[PDB]
Amino acid sequence: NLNETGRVLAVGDGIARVFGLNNIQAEELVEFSSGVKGMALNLEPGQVGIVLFGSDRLVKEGELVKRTGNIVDVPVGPGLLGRVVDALGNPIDGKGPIDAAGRSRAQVKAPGILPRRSVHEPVQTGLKAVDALVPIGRGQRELIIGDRQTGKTAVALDTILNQKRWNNGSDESKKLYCVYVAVGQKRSTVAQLVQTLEQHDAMKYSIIVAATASEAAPLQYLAPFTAASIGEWFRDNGKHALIVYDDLSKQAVAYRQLSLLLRRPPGREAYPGDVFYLHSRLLERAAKLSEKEGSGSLTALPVIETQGGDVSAYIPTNVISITDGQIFLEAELFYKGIRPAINVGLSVSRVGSAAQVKALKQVAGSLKLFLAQYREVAAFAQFGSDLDASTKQTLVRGERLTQLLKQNQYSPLATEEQVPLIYAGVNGHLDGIELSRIGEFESSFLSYLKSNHNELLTEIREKGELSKELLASLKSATESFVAT
């Protein structure tokens, strides 16, 4: 009966050609007699072409192959929370069987034009630079791009850690569950990470999905899709997830590998012709549903690794134009002390203020444009020709604003801590203070505001909007403190 079974013709390099399997579906799962599972991708006339999920030493010519009858799919539901699963959603932590509310497929149509809404909820990262300059919204896709060792993962991590603020509560609709997809990372590096998550009691609301350096190409390529489904459950069921794709550059490396080995002819930099389609259909799966559909969101932070700062290379270019804005990290910025090494100049959030907080919005008026003008005047400064009172003026403020956005890892700030800082900088209360001392200003300021004018800090938080009198109290409060 060659309808439900095939014999192997040849096997090599993760691939097995197979005579038979007549009833097999495109993208169907097959078990080999030896145990190892595989996926059918090329149903040709004479034969079927299978990528393996395992090693192949164990597969020999003529060995019988078996139909599963299922397209690749994953367990979903809140049972996954806290678990470390592989691409197909098998526990790899050691904590035993996953309990699922059901099963999604790996590839799923993105929600149409019809069942969506405007992004209006903030996804607060607690990162001064990010939450004031490039505010991220519940439903939006936001690229994290830069060279190697620039702090891409760190940004993503510090975002996750922050959600503690809301996840230890009981208001289901303020919560943000995180899904972290590890693609092409080494295992120990995923370990080192799940450790830190626990060190911060952040694992009870996360789901790591791992396709490490050593796993089969198909699993790597697949992980992001499977993961997208895991967190699609949350969006569909009235809740909000956050998906971090760390990182797509590798996913494409692996997807290139399937294709070159399946012998599909290659595109530019040996990538397949539709490497763009690869990412587009994934990233579109992030969205903010309409009231009719449960108002659930899914938010995506893809990561992308460049070389030599070149953003004009194939893959980055692709995703850059797929997402609702990017955060550029730079090595140069880093080593001279800006950390996050965000590039204000190049970073954008296309949602913008729609996903900020009204209070933050109010005092962040024009900051991003100003910071641009600042680089402007600082470029003209290289002429080292005498400055006037206008350029020196904006130079002094831009330098202090720059400095005011620097932030230590693992320290996300509440909005009401962010707000007065920004206000002190913008309205120029920081402008007569030494640059090295702005460090001590920040904490010394907040310390004092908590101690004394806590009644403001608690209004900002509760109300999220600086009323006219609250600006007054804050105005007074800042001047007060600056005089020392």
């Binding site: 060792q149 295992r187 350096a213 089969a216 040996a270 080593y335």
Partner: protein
């Protein structure tokens, strides 16, 4: 009984073997062809279909004749493991090549084995003092971590590594496993001399180290594998005999280069820069094995070569993400006569964190880097306009950076036949203080040359008094 095939095809390093019936040797299995010499080894790369496999030879294919009988050995390449191999020089095919008879171990293990699982992972942040200023201070190595030396040709990865062996390996106690991949046999012949002299290897005594060598004269199959042999040996000392293992690889690039050498003959469409399309995962299988686990610590230094001095070449690019500390050698810096020719701005480590090295060492680092990074930013203006066009604060930073830069150079004992000056070893506490003083300008009044090629801060005040006469 024995499973025998027939040689159907020979192309370069590739051999095709046909097997009479059903049971085809598994992929990765060793095959043997009897020669007048001794025997030729082969590794089943793929099943071509129709009872034919395609192998890679572990040696030359000169003289092979179509139709030849080929014996299946029913397992991956085997290697002697355990204490029996200490002070022995070994093959890719796990054989004695030190003209000193059979390595009489208990067990022989496959070179191919799956990398330690995720549950089996084990992390920790313990510094490993090296006595090297640039490293100690800027990118601290970690005990049981993965270290890598990056650089193009003749910048000094080998000599640097010999300095690490010098310090750590002596006062380490536990077992070492040195692996020469695709390097000079001279160097390997030298290292065997070097050990018998320090007494690390004692032909008549005990021994702390082991030697495995698939050198640059070997065919690409040999060189595509010899590192897996080293690894198997180390992995025993780690998991079975629960030991602290020092594992020096040199050079690990030569493994991926070998991979491409054969890749086309294996029938594969090439990838960017003409690399085997499997370059990432073929590295992940090998790298992910060199690791510390809940059963034993492994610290490993690997030498990374950098084709054409391009750091973005797809070989090294992919490496980085496998290391815990990365220290790059610049050609330009060596042409300044600065040694070690490390890049103070490109070198990194997970351990440079206040939680590990402490606020001061942390900050002395950062401040040093800002200084160097500024000097770097100005490289263009100084190139055209020179120093006179810089401001005052800028001007200072440069003279200071140029001092820090020269101070980062350190005489190595092993490299004595190149400096002339007997080599120096500074300590971690020694280095941090020294640099902190310079960053507080407590030495500004000293000629830049004094900072060049000397030990700690004491040696600077010395050389400056010597020259001031």
């Amino acid at each position: 009984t024995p499973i025998t095939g027939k040689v159907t095809a020979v192309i370069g390093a590739i051999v095709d073997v046909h097997f009479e019936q059903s049971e085809l040797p598994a992929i990765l299995n060793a095959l043997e062809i009897k020669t007048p010499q001794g025997k030729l080894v082969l590794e089943v790369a793929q099943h071509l279909g129709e009872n034919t496999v395609r192998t890679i030879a572990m040696d030359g294919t000169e003289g092979l004749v179509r139709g030849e009988k080929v014996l299946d050995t029913g397992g991956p390449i085997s290697v002697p493991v355990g204490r029996e191999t200490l002070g022995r020089i070994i093959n890719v095919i796990g054989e004695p090549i030190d003209e000193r008879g059979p390595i009489k171990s208990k067990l022989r293990k496959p070179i191919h084995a799956d990398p330690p699982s995720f549950a089996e992972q084990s992390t920790s942040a313990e510094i490993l003092e090296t006595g090297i200023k640039v490293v100690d201070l800027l990118a601290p190595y970690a005990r049981g971590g993965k270290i890598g030396l990056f650089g193009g040709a003749g910048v000094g990865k080998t000599v640097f590594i010999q300095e690490l062996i010098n310090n750590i390996a002596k006062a380490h106690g536990g077992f070492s496993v040195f692996t020469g991949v695709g390097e000079r046999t001279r160097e390997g012949n030298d290292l065997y001399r070097e050990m018998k002299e320090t007494g690390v290897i004692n032909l008549e005594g005990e021994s702390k180290v082991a030697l495995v060598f698939g050198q640059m004269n070997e065919p690409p199959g040999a060189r595509a594998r010899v590192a897996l042999t080293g690894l198997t040996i180390a992995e025993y000392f780690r998991d079975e005999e629960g030991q602290d293992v020092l594992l020096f690889i040199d050079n690990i690039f030569r493994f991926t280069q070998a991979g491409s050498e054969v890749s086309a003959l294996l029938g594969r469409i090439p990838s960017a820069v003409g690399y085997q399309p499997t370059l990432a995962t073929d590295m992940g299988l090998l790298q992910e094995r060199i690791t510390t686990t809940k059963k034993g610590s492994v610290t490993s230094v690997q030498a990374v070569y950098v084709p054409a001095d391009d750091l973005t070449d797809p070989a090294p690019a992919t490496t980085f993400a496998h290391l815990d500390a990365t220290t790059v050698l610049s050609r330009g810096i060596s042409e300044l006569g600065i040694y070690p020719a490390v890049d103070p701005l490109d070198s990194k480590s997970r351990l440079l964190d206040a939680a590990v090295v402490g606020q001061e060492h942390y900050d002395v680092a950062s401040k040093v880097q800002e200084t160097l990074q500024t000097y770097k930013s100005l490289q263009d203006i100084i190139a055209i306009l020179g120093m006179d066009e810089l401001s005052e604060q800028d001007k200072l930073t440069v003279e200071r950076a140029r001092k820090i830069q020269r101070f980062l150079s350190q005489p190595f004992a092993v490299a004595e036949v190149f400096t002339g000056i007997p080599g120096k070893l500074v300590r971690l506490k020694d280095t941090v203080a020294s640099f902190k003083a310079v960053l507080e300008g407590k030495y500004d009044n000293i000629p830049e040359h004094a900072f060049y090629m000397v030990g700690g801060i004491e040696d600077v005040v010395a050389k400056a008094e010597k020259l001031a006469a």
